[PDB]
Amino acid sequence: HHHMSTKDLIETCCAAGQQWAIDNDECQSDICRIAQRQCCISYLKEKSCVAGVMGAKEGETCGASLYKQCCDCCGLGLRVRAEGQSCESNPNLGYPCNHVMLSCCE
Amino acid sequence: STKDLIETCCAAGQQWAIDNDECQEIPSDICRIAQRQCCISYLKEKSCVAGVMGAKEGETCGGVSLYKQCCDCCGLGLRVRAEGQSCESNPNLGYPCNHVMLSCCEG
Amino acid sequence: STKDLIETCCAAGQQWAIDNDECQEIPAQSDICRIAQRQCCISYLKEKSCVAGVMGAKEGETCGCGVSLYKQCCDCCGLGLRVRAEGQSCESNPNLGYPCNHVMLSCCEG
Amino acid sequence: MHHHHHHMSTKDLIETCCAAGQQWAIDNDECQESDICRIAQRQCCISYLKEKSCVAGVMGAKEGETCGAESLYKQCCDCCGLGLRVRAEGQSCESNPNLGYPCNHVMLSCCE
Amino acid sequence: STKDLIETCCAAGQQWAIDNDECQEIPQSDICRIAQRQCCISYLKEKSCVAGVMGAKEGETCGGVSLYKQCCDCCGLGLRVRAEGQSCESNPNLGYPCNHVMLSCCEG
Amino acid sequence: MSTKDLIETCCAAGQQWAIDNDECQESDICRIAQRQCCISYLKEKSCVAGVMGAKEGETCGASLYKQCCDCCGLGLRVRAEGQSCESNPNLGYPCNHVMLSCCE
Amino acid sequence: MHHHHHHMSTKDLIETCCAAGQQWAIDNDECQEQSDICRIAQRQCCISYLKEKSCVAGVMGAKEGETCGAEVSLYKQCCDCCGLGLRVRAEGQSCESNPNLGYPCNHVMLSCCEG
Amino acid sequence: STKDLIETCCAAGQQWAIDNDECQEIPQSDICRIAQRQCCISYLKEKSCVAGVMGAKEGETCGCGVSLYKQCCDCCGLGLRVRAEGQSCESNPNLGYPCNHVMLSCCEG
C-alpha cells in the first residue's frame, strides 16, 4: 500500500507525472495513475502551446495538436490587430484558443 | 469585420458540432480557424459535462472527448470531499481538470 | 437518488450556462435530469443577466427566444432610481412580478 | 404646438400603468398592448399571464398531462413534475434554490 | 423678370411632383429648368419627410429622393430620448433635416 | 451608455468614417446615427465643392455636387443680370440658401 | 451553487449510519446499499448483521447434521468450526481454546464443544 | 486424537500463510482441512488488520480475498476522527469484529 492521504497522493503523483514529462517527452493506485497522467499531459500541452504561440509571432507555419491550435489561434489575434481592430473575448473559441488569441491581439 | 466573421464562422462550427458530433470534415483562414476551434470547444465542453455527471453517478471513467478526463478529475475531487478534507487548487492538473476537480470537491 | 440526480444535473446545467451563453441546445437521459439541467441553466443566465442589467441602470444606461433579463432588470432598476431621484420612497408592487419588484425596490432604497 | 402636459409623480405613474397592464392582460390574453409607463404596463401585463400560465402548468402536472416536448406552462409543469416524482418515490422534499424562481417554489409545493 | 420666372418654373416643378411623383422628366432656359427640378425635388422631399415623421410616431418600422426612411429614423431618435424622460440636444452633424426632425420629435 | 451619449458617439464615428473613406457603407440607434452623420458630412462636402465649381465657371453636368452647382448658378445668373436676389424657400434646403449666397 | 450543509459530529454520524446499515441488512439481505465515515459505518454494520446471522445458521446446521458445503456468509465457516467442537466432544475430550482458529471460529468451536 | 490433529493441521495452515500470502490453494480428513484453512485465514486476517491499523495511524485514508487491510484502516480511521474532535469513544458492537475493537483502540490514548 501507501501511507499517505488521497490529497497528498494526488500532489505526489502529479509532481511525478510532471517530472516524467520533463525527463521524457511522453506520458507512458488508480488515483495516482490519473494524477500522474493528467499532470504529465498538461505539461506537454502547455509547452507545445507556448511553442505554437512563439511560432505564430515569428512568422512560422502552423502546419496543414496544441502547437497547431495555439499557432492558429495566435494568428487570429495577429490578423485582427494587423487590421487596426480591437480584440474581443470570444469564449466560444474555447481554452486555450480564446486566451491565446487575445494575448496575441493585444 | 474580422470580429463579425469570427462570430459567424464560430456559430457555423458550433452548428456543425451539433449536426455531426465531429469536426474532421468541416466546410478564409480566419473563418476556417474559428469554425474548427468552436466546433472542437463545443464537443469538448459537452463531453466534459457528461464526464462530470458520470463521476457523480458512480460510473467508471475508463477525437476530442473529455469524457474520461473530466470523469477522472471529478472523481479526484469527490474522493477528497468524501474523506471530509478540503481540496487545494493544483494548476499543474491543467484545464479543465483542476477546475473540475475543485467543483466536484466543493459540492 | 432523485435528490442527488437533481443536484448532479443541476450542476451540469449551470456548467453548460457558464461554458456557452445559452440553454436551448443543452445535450439516453431521464426527464428528471433534463428538467433540472435546463432549469438550472436558465436560472443561472437569468440571475447573471439581471445583475448585469441592474449595474447598467445604476451606471446611467437607458434600457428601452432568449432568457436574458438584462433589459428587464435594467428597466425595473430604472423605475426605482427615478422614484428615488424624486426624493420619494418606493412601495412594493408585486404585480410587477419577480424579479422586477425586488429589483425596483433595491434600486430605490440604495 | 400645444400639448397636454401631466405632472404625475413617477410612483403614481407606475401604479397607474401597472393597473392598466394587468387590466389589459385580463381583457385580452396578449401583452401586445413614457418609458416608465410602458415598462410598468408591460411588466404587470406579463406577470399576470406568467402567473396564470404557471398555475395552469402546475394543474397540468398534477392531472398527469404532458408538459410538452424539448413557456411558463411548460416550465411550471416540468418543475411540478420534479416534486411529484420525488414524492411518488416516498422521499422528502428539499429546497433547491439553484432551480430558480418559480421552479423551486413550484417543485416544493408539488412535492409537499 | 428672373425672379418671376423662378416662381413660375418652381410652381411647374411642384405641379409635376404632384402629378407624377418623380422629377426626372422635364416638361427653354437653364434658369427655368433648374427651378423646376429643384422645386420638384424639394416638394417630394418635404412630403416624404412628413410621412416619415408620422410613420415613426405611429410605431412603423423605417425603410430617388424619398426622405421617408431618413425622417422616420431621425424622428425615432428624438422619440426614444423623449421616452426616457431626457431632453434632446441639437446635433448639427446629423444634417438637415435629420437634426430638426429629431428635435421636433423629441420636444413633442 | 445612455441613448443620448450613444448617438453622439456613433455620430462622431460616422463622421470619422466619412473622412477616412469617401463612402457610407460602414444597436439600430447607433447604426442610424453613424450613417446619418456619415452621409451629412459627404453631402455638405459635395455641396461646398459644387458651389465652388459654379463660382469658378465649371459645368455642373447634364447629386449634391450638381444640385449645389445648379442652385449657385441660379444666383449667379440673377446677379449677372443686375437684379436683386429674393429668397425662394420653395427651392428647399440647401438650394435656396446656396442660391442667395451666390447671388449676394 | 447553493448546497445543504449539515454539521453532525463523527460519533453521531457513525451511530446514525450504523443503524441505517443494520436496518438495511434486516430489510434486504444484501449490503449493496455521501461521506466516507457514513459509508464505512453503514457497510460495516450491514455486513456484521448478515455475518452473525449466517454464522448462527451455520452453527445450527452443524448441530442438525447438515452439510457445511465444499472447497459475506459465514454459514460454511461456522458450520465447519462448530463441527470441530462437536468431534472433540464426541471423542470424550475436553475443549481447549485455540486462538489460532481466529474469530469467530474459536468461539464457535468452544461453544459447540461445551454445549 | 482429534485435538492433536487440529493443532497439527492448524500449525500447517499458519506455516502456509507465513510462507505464501494466500490460503486459496491450501494443499486428508475434514477436521484437518478445516483447521488448516481456518488457521491460514486467521493469520492473514490478523496480519493485514494490524498493517491496516498502522496505515491509518500513519495518515493513510482508506475510504473475494481475506485481507482486512482496508476494513481495519477504515475502522481505525473512525476512531481517529472521533478522537481528533476531542470526543470520547463509545463501543458500538454492531460494527462487528474487529471493526469495533479497532475503532476503540485507535480512539483511545
Curated annotation (Swiss-Prot), chain H:
Residues 9-47, 48-74, 75-107 form the Anaphylatoxin-like domain. Disulfide bonds join 9-32, 10-39, 23-40, 49-72, 62-73, 75-99, 76-106, 89-107. Transmembrane segments: none annotated. It comes from the Eukaryota. Induction: Glucocorticoids suppressed mRNA expression and protein synthesis. Component of both basement membranes and other connective tissues. Homotrimer; disulfide-linked. Interacts with LAMA2. Interacts with FBN1 (via N-terminal domain). Forms a ternary complex with ELN and FBN1. This is Fibulin-2. The gene is Fbln2.
